């Protein structure tokens, strides 16, 4: 979410002494948005709690030996047709499950 979203308004809060309750409201104007309310997650418009950032830890690096171990386990369970049918592959006429074909 953009950093400017919610804070492009200039909303100084009406303080104590009025019937409003301590929300930053839009200064003046003969507009529908005039003394309305901004600068909060609870307000219409404004910005939310915790704006999502681009510098989140998006990516994960795994150990190379763990990646090789997982890919060897995947190649080993590419055999064993009880693990292949439980995946959901229709197998009923496959002549041999390590299906090795020609170089053609």
């Amino acid at each position: 979410v953009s950093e400017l979203a919610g804070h492009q308004t200039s909303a100084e809060s009406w303080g104590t002494g009025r019937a409003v309750a301590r929300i930053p409201r839009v200064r003046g104007g003969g507009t529908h948005r005039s003394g309305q309310g901004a600068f909060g997650n609870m307000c219409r418009g404004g910005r939310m709690f915790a704006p999502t950032k681009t510098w989140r830890r998006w990516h994960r690096r795994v150990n190379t030996t763990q990646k090789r171990y997982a890919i060897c386990s995947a190649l080993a369970a590419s055999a064993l047709p009880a693990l292949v049918m439980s995946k959901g592959h229709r197998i009923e006429e496959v002549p041999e499950l390590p299906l090795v074909v020609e170089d053609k």
Binding site: G17, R18, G28, G29, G30, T31, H32, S34, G35
Partner: peptide, 24 residues
């Protein structure tokens, strides 16, 4: 016609008004 603005803040109760005062 334009949207009417919020009712002004009437500086009604304070040191200046003798219409109702608390114990002082």
């Amino acid at each position: 016609d334009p949207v009417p603005y919020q009712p002004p803040f009437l500086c009604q109760w304070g040191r200046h008004q003798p219409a109702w005062k608390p114990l002082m």
